[PDB]
């Protein structure tokens, strides 16, 4: 989904 | 978000991970105190006095990120070559620090509420009471029920009291119409009486996931509403000005065409469509296409958020 | 879900995989008896006596998990760097354990049903008879057929007896109405007579895939039904209470508005909509938007499951 | 699907690719004759007589698959760590063989049609003529045209003769109704006259992409049609048997309800829906839900194929 | 799009990146001047005089891409094993040159518009004025307003002259009908007066993202329109010729069936459908299926573009 | 109106 975990958590 | 990195010119040491040799400056290891590699007290056990090397019979692919933590001076991230469990097992062994481990994880009576002590019955009883209250409400709106409603409200008040947060707000809302009991005030309180259906959020997990998704995508919901507002205004104005040139006008005004524009954008369907002329039909076709596009645009983000929350929960 | 790892202090050995050197002491290999590396008997052939070094002329990127399987003491997790075929042969070559291989599989007369020995004609006849029975059913519902139905039923019974599971249940069901033959019971049996269409699951592969997907998505289906139920109840209540202030009420009661709520949530379209006032129209727009969102939320999980099952089958 | 791998007991050599040392025996090299490494003639240049090493100043991560060709004896998959261009040059350098490159590639006058020689004017004229023919048709069906139709057919047959494959089949079909010209036969030929619109496949690229996707998605198209057929039959039977218990029968027979089932499953909308009772409304709600699910099931295969073809073309 | 690779026969040097040894020709290093490795002056400090090697205490997994730039002689691309920030730091560490890093970035008064200096109040006032103008327009179309419309136009033109792309074009358009003020011309100007709703593009970021997505998906929009046109024509012809065999013909002509074809393709719903016979119903079912398919086809490209732009912004 | 919001993955 997100390559670098963009906008992960909050 | 900013970190410090070692600078070169003393003594260079070699670290062996199951045959993979790593050469690092002692200054790089000394940046982070404590830890296995940070201090020599807990490195003598793994140090080889013969070959002058430190041996760690572990997984070789995971040592690059662990070493890079010293190299980056604070930046720790799991490379996409290994599962989460294998990376997790590594960090405790090297003991990167409680502040480092938990921060990395972020990157990844009163018996009633709990579902145990064989009191699950209480939860089942509450769910049955909620369903019964919904059924009695719907049947009361049909062309007695007051006693059952009183019993349901008594149970709701007792449950809220023994518990005594959005769930608490819903619980307190569920009884305000009953304790309260112009015609507009009566109409609105009878309407807000329906919020008893939201009391299922305590017991249902999918409802909680949906609520979390709605909370986490407020910007996306606002953008979707904004796009629908722009579309309905534009297309209602277009169709009204297209059909203003006829003696018998299907749409009396732009606000009258808001419903037609909304149902065409959403592809619900207005119904009868014959009296509208050719220009109105062209505007309606454009409105349908634009509605499909503008509703298919922002929904995927909410869908992905819901999927992520559901997978995290399960 | 717990595994053990060798701890440091005996003798260390070196493993060579196409030039890539691996260092590991004997206790890690001694953790797993048998296998190519666990016992010395099956590894002395690949040992080089002059260099005191084990040589393995194999692929270097796939050996990392092989060593980690010994390192992790049972946790054999595939690395995503290679195709499945190369990793399949690598584990067999080391004979890491017959029981060990099995868990990796899920980690990644009576001549009638088997479509061979020319039994393909017997199948074709079964499909033709099923289609003929469906056609005769639809035709007898139009404003003789009894003989054709009798032939279809006797063929079904003969097939069931020859074969003598959900398919078996469907086959038994397909003849129960005919063997049976208040008005309600007659209507029920006539309705359940349609279950003959499900007999195509034996021959159709896509129908089997759909059935497996439905079996594997029961939670998703339940969540979808729950969301639609909540939305329908809420919006029916909203529209009924919005229209309760008019002399000519389009909706007599909340249950009366259930059909309108369902068709608006599913975007099917109610049809005639003019008598509804402005508040009802606002509630309808909100219902349409919420229905689009609610339908869009849990579908791309059943969709993914169906795609996975279809690709696995094909 | 099967290949042979070298087995040990003679002579072994080392390959040094910019510091990444690879050690393989000559038997592995000798399995593939020719090539850069198969014969000593074309690999002696890179050989270093001083260190007895083969030096290859190329990219390290791409050599794993190159050695795997010798390792597996005919099996080649690209490792997922490098772009396609990097590996394409890498394999071409070692000249694995024309059959090898082709295998890897598959695993990942008459001046009229060729749009050059500033004949693009011919293509523009053809597109304009096709559009004019479509317009002439759509206005000749309204409540002279024959001359323009004759001119369009003359241009079509001239282009066909000059050019003289389903596209050629469409070109043949586009003139058959005109050259031909019971009432049913006349209606059929007038209908098949519309296939002039498909002549745009010659010029448009998106139309060709759609045609290729439809050809490559025949299985899921058939599956979608089968699912629609099953759902329509089931729900038509259910609604007919649920509603037939009243004096006023909205549906005369099961075939009568096929259109309603189709529009409900596809969410088009039947329209007026009042006379059907509560059981029919429940059946309709279930039909709408099941139709949404069944039409959402197979289409994320068709769309994926279309996206792949579109990206390949562009 | 063409690059040159070093060809052997003169000296070879070894690079030690945190234990990972690399062997590369000196001519490869000399292909790119300047930089850390291009000249001995900027790399002599990092050199190890006793081991005859260069010791780089940096991230070893990312050195392969750095070496490939010299190996390929002009090609730089990050492999998918490290975050982009790590690679961005590494290339700055070696200082490949701004002439090379520049093409890598895209590989993956006048105080009014700038929302700072306590000017956000001006933006709020502008948004309120735009909303008020839209409301007055919608209300005056109902069965005075002129003064409020004049005030809104005065504010719009004041902002335009104070500030004096496409947003400026929209701002100019928003006052053209007012400054102008056959029946067709009046209808056209009253219709184009609605363009005031597009002035919200200046303030709203999501609407700007939508505009960028529309600009970047013109080919897909055209393909969608073309597919809809083809399907509409085909199914209108089919249904008209199916229902032309009855005295009471529901559709008078193929153009009359265009609306029915559009609503069936888009699954909106024609409404009354009883008089059409069995052949027309079959044609309608086929039209509904084909509409669902042909609309679901080209959408998850506009969707992908919108998602990309939203994540970027 | 908007359930075909698919993506990649699936393998
Ligand atoms: K619809
Ligand atoms: K609809």
Author numbering:
A (entry chain J): 2 to 11
B (entry chain B), C (entry chain A), D (entry chain C): 83 to 91, 96 to 194, 216 to 250, 278 to 298, 310 to 326, 357 to 489
E (entry chain D): 83 to 91, 96 to 194, 216 to 250, 278 to 298, 310 to 326, 357 to 488
F (entry chain I): 2 to 12
Give the article text:
Here we investigate the mechanism of fast inactivation in the Shaker Kv channel using cryo-electron microscopy, mass spectrometry and electrophysiology. We resolved structures of a fully inactivated state in which the non-polar end of the N terminus plugs the internal pore in an extended conformation.
To increase our chances of obtaining high-resolution structures of the N-type-inactivated state, we introduced two mutations (E12K and D13K) that enhance inactivation (EI Shaker) by dramatically increasing the association rate for binding of the N-terminal inactivation peptide to the channel. Analysis of this construct using mass spectrometry revealed cleavage of the N-terminal Met and acetylation of Ala2. In class C resolved to 3.05 Å, we observed continuous density plugging the internal pore similarly to what we observed for class A in GT Shaker. Although the density corresponding to the N terminus inside the pore was weaker than that for the surrounding pore domain, leaving open the possibility that the density arises from an average of alternative conformations, the N terminus adopts an extended conformation. We also observed extra density entering the chamber through the window formed by the linkers between the cytoplasmic T1 domain and the S1 transmembrane helices that we attribute to a second N terminus. Although mutations at Y8 destabilize the inactivated state20, their effects are modest, and in AcA-EI Shaker, the second N-terminal peptide in the chamber displaces Y8 so that it is no longer near N482, suggesting that any interaction between Y8 and N482 is weak.
